[PDB]
DNA sequence: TTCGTAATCATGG
DNA sequence: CCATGATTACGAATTGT
């Protein structure tokens, strides 16, 4: 009676229960129903005075509570912590019951349960079946699960069962709503307990005029008219609304494990259920496993944006990557071909030539280990390819090697030898396609609804969301439903209350918490020399190690108003409170009278937030070496989940100290930790500034010494390196944040810049550095270009590369979707970002000849494209969508509308994209005093065509421009001098 | 929402807003607290020169009634309500007051809540009382209230009036007499039985005279009022160095002048001069001599003595010599608090009378040395706070600071 | 004061100058629901649908809300009960009754009383079926709510589930209160003490109170 | 919760 | 007086057709 646990989820019904679901070995579902009490601590007291005696109680030990509440001190005579050691009980009550002087309120009934119990939300156990009673098929009942679960296994692989759907509706000139469009195209993909995989497609009937139906069933479809004549095994399948529809209800009414789907809480389920409802009375009704709970689908909200959430109760996840992927890490655009196009890439060689067609060749000697598996095995059902990051092409024919691929595309001929391939954009109008239906089209449709269908499928392996649903359920003490639910105060209350147990110790605020009330900027932004990337190791986490900053070891907070104060106190914190037991740390004071403010802390004895980092710190570190010392790949994959999960919770800490409504709330502390933050790290940026390689030895620009107190280290600034003798380099410093530092070296060949980088950072760690603060070399960049950590542009290195590797090309903070831009505009910034990244390569570029050769150019081209009238009028054309939501009188876009709807038998909905530009009569010469725009906007249609009296406003456009530009470069007053020459305005910078 | 402590809550605001007062730091501060508390929860909310009408100021003929007249006093007005601390016009600062008249107050204030607030005159520490604000109870039942806590009452008189009456100037010099009062009048506020607004008549002149030159006399404890002089030796009261300053007096010239029947004050300068304040200050301290630093609304000594003022403080026998000084100390035992509660900074600046901001600006620009917990050496590090006059008193007054801040360390090392 | 038209039923409707800037809209959403909501007979009949559009904006400062019409017999004003005999009618009655202290009462008209109007959130209901129709006019009544919440002052809201994030589904904040379960066990809207916080916040307002006694029918 | 453009208003060189 | 500077308001950066 061996189980694994999947899932636990509860009931919300008259009667509150919780649910355990678990596979065995052979693949049998079991589900376990508990009884779930309320949780509270009191103290000994305080439960032999309780007049109706609680349900059952359970006794903890001695416990002390400390209060945490902070207060000021304008003098040195500081009143001391008061702890309060007591006998501590824990009470559990079926019903909600309020107790005056309970303690320890902050954690969720779910933990206590857990904890409680002594059961890890996903491990595997050896059931006992003296306590489990059965009360249907497959649900069982037990009342005391601490001896149910006394047994603990090693675990054991089970099955799964997933699906993945998607959906295409109709739709002629706006978003699709539920009362005028129906459904054309829905797509599955199947996978059930016995590992076979089914993709399956069913096609609405009602655009299909009888003899298309007739000849679709000839070519090798099928048509069904009832509910009972679908099989699965038919790839496609036709059908009217209504059958679609109960086979969609049918489909989501299953016990499955995870229904998975892009955007689908939204959109997709919303779609069919409301349809559904429209079409006929029937709806979805989801049923509890002991068959006593019955519910309706309604999508609810939760703001995080808005969020949207499914009320399943049958232990189903549905699960949304969209949310998951805005959640876990951060992208330029969060739609789904561009998050394809990041993630499914590879390299190929080009083998053939000629016409209008290409035939490229992917194996594992090309790009890496893997990456050709990978995009073989998105090719399967993919449709278009994307080339070069430019162009879009059209497969035609594709072989999948034995260990690699092959593609033919229709794509023209390119001189080069080896091309980049990704998935992602699809050059389609489906309005169009939904003009003139016909099967071919409708064939071509059901052929993409699969692939997207299946992308969701390929995203969720490649994210590896399960092993990381297992990993933080399992650190965090949660359900694994409610893993990627909640934002970081929730998952950080079970291992603080598993620490708390483990230290015996309760922290209390006895008081209200009242409201009290940096960005960094590089020297300089175009570099032309190499620069080397260095990583922080975690340096919140181990200065608060080394400060010993918590809540219940701050001796005390010392303010001073006056010059008198301040210097008596300093006077007597150095005589009384001495280094290296404790610790003082200045901070920026708190009120606006107070000069000089100082937290003290204690080192004697080690706190709980330091306690809770080292143990993080300890157990990555364990998961990272067996992680390397691994071969199967389910392993492999499992470590990473751990190591990720220990990450993500690790690095959340110095934000809940910050937070008024946390667990781990310290003003002190949080002052303390950035101010200690800021010195480490202007104490490296000083003394790596300036620090030259001479003969053998290195020499830096300032002396080491301990920016905290005395140290029993050597301070010599010489330090006796093994590199080649004849090497002299000299480094500079331009950047530096929490989590990096940037270093510039001045030469182009990488691999001896990387050596040494590597032997720098040896140097650094071995012996300017102390305690536990380390660095690691991360990356070498060329071509750097750089505002802020926002936005940049260059060329990537890994460390272990040599000269003869393919760069990575960096580029963010720039959207490249923000369809409200131009289309001119976005060539231009293209070809001369790529003509600024040729020169930044010459090697003679200083900083005073780059700024005038791009304004020549610029000079050059804009004029051209003035005096040449040359481009068409598609590439000036903006768009706006229109909605009359709007605030104020008049907002002359609303009246422009009107206007065209009244002087044009074309109407415009309330909904519809429209699209506009800038048109003036041609007579006006270039202008350089700029006017209100708003009056120069006009609606251009389909069949508008730009007559002789007529031309566009080529300065706004201009303008808009080189603003863009001159945001890049060096030098200010060149910049400014051009723009007030041009358009006569002011550059808004920045 | 389901209880009435918030209902009970928001008719305390509406009460607030009935009486709001920006004077007061800490209730504007729970104000602001209790705003932001209701936006936040409930998503939104909705949130005494108007209490006197024009001046009479000449001759017109009354309505015939039941009146009530209060002579207004010269000097300075302070208001205090139910709530509230103290308050002075213009600025709205605090001052220190004893506390058995907090408890008169507050006992005559919760007697009858239809009072908003009490009136109180001060002139050269002499507080008396002018009138009274209450929408249910007229001020003349309370005078007997507030006589018998032993606080002074003003001369009030209830006339009734038949037939229509001129308010000529003889009319007021008759009133005069018959309030018979030796403190100076300086307008009449008179109000009619069953009307909230009260109103009040100053008839003015004015001219120009010759005044000889500006001197200062001896209020008490370093407290200065300036005093001006003329050729005919007549005394024109002054109301603070601020009316002083503000009204652009020039020594030895020929200024306009208020008067009253009895009395002649000095009025606010309307030119459209460009004179500044700054240099203002300065040529009159020059005039009136770089012994004297302004505490605002007064002027101090800068006397060395240095032992001669914690004794006064500290409301102990005079002392000769640290050892007996030791003793005298030790022998009292309730005073022991205030030495055993409050800081040694601040305690010096009380005993010698220093202004909180100047001082505490002043010794945030210029260096110490501190050796063995004591003062020994200081010096400048930024010379442009010295611009100011006040500044280079205290600084020549600095070196007295620093020797009773040395003995009173001294001696509280020695007593713990 | 004025009249559109419109292709399906009522096939006219009238409407007051104050809901004249947005009530275009309405029929650009009201064309895509008209068809389906006519297949099953709805209380009370589609010629009542919208005469609340009558009462103007300018001389209201509260707002009372409803999530449903009256299943059965309906008529179109809102919290109207000729006979009082719905529950909670009777409720609001007798709760007035009580606040006022006024022991004999024979009924109680919302509409009569300057200052509040009689709205529901849902304009129309299936007999037998309670809320079964808040697809089909989700849009409108958000733009309705949208309008009405610019003109009055303070708005008490009916219904702690019904209306539970309110604060969301309108952008600009106003003032606004939830109120309880009109018929909800053990006596909690009893309890209730939403009359006299919406006064106080009227006065707060600067505006005069409501003198409910106006709506007692005698 | 972000930023960036456009129209408006307001202040010291 | 007005170029210069600083506020205020707008609306997609949205995602699913």
Redesign the interface.
């Known amino acids: 009676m061996d189980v694994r646990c999947i899932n636990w989820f509860e009931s919300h019904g008259e009667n509150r229960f919780l649910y355990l679901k678990s596979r065995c070995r052979n693949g049998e579902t079991v589900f376990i129903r508990f009884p779930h009490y309320f949780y509270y601590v009191v103290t000994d007291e305080i439960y032999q005075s309780l007049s109706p005696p609680p349900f059952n109680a359970r006794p903890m030990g001695k416990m002390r509570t400390i209060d945490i509440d902070e207060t000021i001190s304008y003098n040195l005579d500081i009143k001391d912590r008061k702890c309060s050691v007591a006998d501590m009980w824990l009470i559990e009550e079926p019903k909600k019951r309020s107790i005056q002087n309970a303690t320890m309120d902050e954690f969720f009934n779910i933990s206590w349960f857990y904890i409680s119990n002594g059961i890890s939300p996903d491990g595997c156990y050896s059931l006992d079946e003296q306590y489990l009673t059965k009360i249907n098929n497959g649900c069982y009942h037990c009342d005391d699960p601490r001896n149910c679960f006394a047994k603990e296994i090693p675990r054991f692989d089970i099955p799964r069962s997933y699906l993945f759907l998607a959906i295409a509706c109709h739709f002629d000139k706006k978003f699709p709503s539920v009362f005028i469009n129906p459904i054309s195209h829905t797509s599955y993909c199947y996978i059930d307990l016995s590992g076979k995989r089914l993709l399956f497609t069913l096609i609405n009937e009602e655009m299909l005029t009888e003899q298309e139906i007739q000849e679709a069933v000839d070519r090798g479809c099928l048509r069904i008219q009832s509910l009972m004549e679908m099989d699965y095994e038919r790839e496609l399948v036709l059908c009217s609304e209504i059958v679609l529809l109960r086979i969609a209800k049918q489909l989501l009414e299953l016990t499955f494990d995870y229904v998975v789907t892009f955007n689908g809480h939204n959109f997709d389920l919303r779609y069919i259920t409301n349809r559904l409802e429209l079409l006929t009375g029937e709806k979805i009704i989801f049923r509890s496993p002991d068959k006593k709970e019955a519910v309706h689908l309604c999508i609810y909200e939760r703001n995080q944006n808005t969020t949207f959430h499914v009320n399943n109760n049958n232990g189903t996840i549905f699960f949304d990557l969209y949310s998951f992927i805005q959640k876990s890490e951060k992208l330029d655009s969060y739609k789904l071909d561009s998050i394809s196009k990041n993630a499914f890439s590879c390299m190929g060689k080009v083998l053939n030539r000629g016409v209008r067609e290409m035939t490229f060749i992917g194996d594992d000697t090309t790009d890496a280990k893997g990456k050709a598996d990978t995009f073989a095995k998105v090719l399967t059902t993919g449709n278009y390819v994307t080339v070069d990051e430019d162009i879009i092409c059209k497969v035609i024919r594709k072989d999948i090697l034995e260990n690699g691929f092959k593609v033919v595309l229709s794509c023209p001929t390119l001189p080069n030898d080896i091309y980049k391939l990704s998935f992602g954009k699809d050059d389609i109008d489906l309005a169009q396609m939904y003009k003139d239906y016909n099967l071919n089209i409708a064939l071509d449709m059901a052929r993409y609804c699969i692939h997207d269908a299946c992308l969701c499928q390929y995203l969720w392996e490649y994210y590896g969301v399960e092993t990381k649903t297992d990993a933080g359920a399992a650190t965090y003490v949660l359900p694994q439903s409610m893993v990627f639910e909640y934002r970081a105060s929730t998952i950080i209350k079970g291992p603080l209350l598993k620490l708390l147990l483990e230290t015996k110790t309760i922290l209390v605020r006895s008081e209200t918490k009242q409201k009290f009330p940096k960005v960094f900027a590089p020297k300089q932004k175009m570099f032309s020399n190499n620069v080397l990337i260095f990583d922080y190791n975690s340096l919140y986490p181990n200065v608060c190690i080394f400060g010993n900053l918590s809540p219940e070891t701050l001796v005390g907070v010392v303010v001073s108003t006056n010059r008198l104060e301040e210097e008596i106190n300093n006077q007597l914190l150095l005589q009384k409170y001495p280094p290296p037991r404790y610790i003082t740390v200045h901070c920026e004071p708190r009120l606006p009278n107070l000069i000089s403010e100082i937290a003290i802390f204690d080192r004697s004895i080690e706190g709980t937030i330091p306690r809770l980092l080292r143990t993080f710190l300890a157990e990555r570190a364990r998961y990272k070496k067996m992680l390397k010392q691994a071969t199967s790949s389910t392993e492999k994959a499992i470590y990473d989940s751990m190591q990720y999960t220990y990450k993500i919770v690790a690095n959340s800490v110095y934000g809940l100290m910050g937070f008024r409504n946390s667990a781990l709330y310290s003003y002190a502390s949080a002052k303390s930790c950035t101010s200690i933050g800021r010195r480490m790290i202007l104490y490296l940026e000083s003394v790596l500034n300036g620090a030259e390689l001479s003969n053998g030895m290195l020499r830096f620009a300032n002396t080491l010494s301990n920016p905290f107190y005395m140290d029993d280290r050597d301070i010599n600034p010489i330090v006796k390196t093994s590199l080649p003798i004849d090497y002299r380099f000299r480094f500079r410093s331009v950047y530096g944040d929490t989590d990096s530092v940037f270093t510039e070296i001045d030469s182009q060949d990488v691999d001896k810049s990387i050596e040494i980088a590597k032997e720098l950072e040896r140097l650094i760690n071995s012996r300017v550095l102390f305690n536990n603060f380390k660095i690691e070399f991360e990356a070498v960049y060329k071509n750097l270009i750089m505002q802020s950590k926002k936005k940049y542009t260059t060329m990537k290195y890994s460390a272990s590369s040599n000269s003869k590797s393919v760069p990575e090309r960096i580029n963010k903070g720039t959207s490249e979707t923000r369809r409200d831009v131009s289309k001119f505009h976005k060539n231009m910034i293209k070809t001369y970002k790529t003509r600024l990244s040729e020169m930044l390569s010459e090697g003679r570029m200083n900083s005073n000849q780059v700024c005038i050769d791009i304004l020549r150019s610029l000079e050059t081209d804009l004029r051209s494209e003035f005096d040449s009238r040359s481009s068409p009028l598609e590439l000036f054309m903006l768009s706006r969508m229109h909605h009359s939501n709007y605030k104020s009188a008049d907002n002359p876009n609303m009246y422009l509308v009107t206007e065209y709807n009244k002087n044009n038998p074309e109407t415009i909905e309330l909904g519809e994209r429209y699209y506009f530009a800038y048109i003036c009569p041609a007579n006006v010469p270039w202008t350089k005093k700029l006017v209100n725009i708003k009056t120069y906007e006009t609606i251009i249609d389909r069949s508008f065509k730009l007559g002789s009296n007529q031309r566009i406003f080529y300065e706004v456009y201009f303008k808009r421009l080189t603003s863009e530009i001159v945001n890049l470069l060096d030098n200010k007053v060149l910049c400014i001098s051009f723009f007030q020459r041009m358009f006569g305005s002011r550059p808004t910078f920045y | ?4 402590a ?2 009970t809550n ?2 305390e ?2 009460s607030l ?1 009935k009486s709001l007062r920006f004077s007061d730091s800490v209730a504007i501060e729970k104000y602001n607290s209790l705003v932001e508390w209701g936006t936040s929860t ?6 005494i020169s108007d209490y006197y009408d024009e001046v009479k100021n000449k001759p017109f003929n009354i309505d015939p009634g039941y009146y009530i007249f209060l002579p207004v006093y010269f000097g300075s007005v302070f208001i205090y309500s139910k709530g509230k601390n103290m308050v002075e016009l213009g600025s709205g600062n605090s001052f220190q007051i004893p506390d058995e008249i907090r408890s008169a107050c507050n006992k005559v204030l919760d007697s009858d809540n239809g009072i908003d607030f009490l009136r109180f005159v001060l002139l050269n520490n002499r507080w008396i009382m002018e009138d009274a604000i209450s929408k249910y109870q007229s001020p003349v039942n309370i005078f007997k209230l507030a006589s018998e806590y032993g606080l002074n009452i003003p001369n009030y008189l209830e006339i009734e009036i038949e037939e229509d009456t001129l308010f000529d100037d003889e009319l007021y010099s008759i009133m005069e007499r018959s309030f018979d009062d030796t403190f100076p009048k300086i307008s009449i506020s008179y109000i009619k039985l069953g009307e909230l607004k009260r109103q009040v008549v100053d008839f003015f002149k004015f001219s120009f005279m010759y005044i000889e030159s500006i001197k200062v006399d001896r209020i008490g404890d370093n407290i200065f009022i300036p005093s001006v002089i003329t050729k005919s030796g007549k005394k024109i009261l002054v109301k603070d160095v601020d009316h002083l300053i503000r009204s652009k007096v020039r020594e030895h010239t020929f200024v306009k002048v208020k008067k009253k029947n009895t009395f002649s004050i000095l009025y606010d300068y309307d030119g459209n001069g460009t004179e500044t304040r700054g240099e203002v200050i300065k040529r009159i301290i020059d005039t009136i001599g770089r012994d004297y630093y302004v505490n605002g609304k007064y002027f101090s000594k800068v006397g060395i003595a240095g032992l001669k003022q914690l004794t006064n403080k500290l409301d102990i026998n005079e002392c000769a010599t640290v050892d007996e000084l030791v003793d005298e100390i030790n022998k009292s035992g309730t005073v022991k608090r205030k030495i055993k509660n409050q ?1 040694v ?1 601040d305690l010096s600046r009380e005993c010698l009378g220093y202004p909180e901001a100047d001082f ?1 600006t002043l ?2 620009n ?3 040395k ?1 050796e063995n ?1 004591k ?1 020994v050496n200081f010096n400048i590090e930024n010379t442009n706070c010295l611009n100011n006059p006040s500044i280079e008193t205290i600084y020549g007054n600095f070196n007295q600071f620093v020797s009773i801040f040395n003995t009173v360390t001294d001696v509280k090392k020695r007593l713990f | 004061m004025n009249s559109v038209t419109i292709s399906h039923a009522p096939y006219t409707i009238t409407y007051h100058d104050d809901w004249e800037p947005v009530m275009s809209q309405l029929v650009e959403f009201y064309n895509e629901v008209a068809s389906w909501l006519l297949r099953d007979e709805t209380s009370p009949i589609p010629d009542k649908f919208f005469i609340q559009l009558k009462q103007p904006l300018r001389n209201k400062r509260v707002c009372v809300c409803g999530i449903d019409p009256y299943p059965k017999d309906g008529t179109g004003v809102p919290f109207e009960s000729p006979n009082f005999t719905k529950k909670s009618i009777k409720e609001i009655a007798s709760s007035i009754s009580r606040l006022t202290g006024v022991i004999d009462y024979k009924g109680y008209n919302l509409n009569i009383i300057d200052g509040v109007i009689p709205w529901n959130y849902y304009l129309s209901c299936k007999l037998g079926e309670t809320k079964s129709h808040a697809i089909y006019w989700d849009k409108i009544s958000k733009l309705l709510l949208q309008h009405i919440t610019k003109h009055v002052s303070v708005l008490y809201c009916l219904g702690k589930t019904d209306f539970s994030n309110i604060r969301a589904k309108l952008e600009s904040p106003v003032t606004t209160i939830v109120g309880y379960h009109p018929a909800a066990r053990d006596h909690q809207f009893e309890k209730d003490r939403s009359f006299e916080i919406i006064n106080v916040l009227l006065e707060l307002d600067n505006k005069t109170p409501i003198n409910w006694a106006q709506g007692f029918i005698y």
Request: aromatic share 18%.
């Open positions: 929402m389901t209880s009435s918030d209902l928001l008719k605001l509406l807003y409930y998503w939104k909310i909705g949130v800081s900074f505490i010794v945030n210029m260096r110490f501190i917990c003062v």
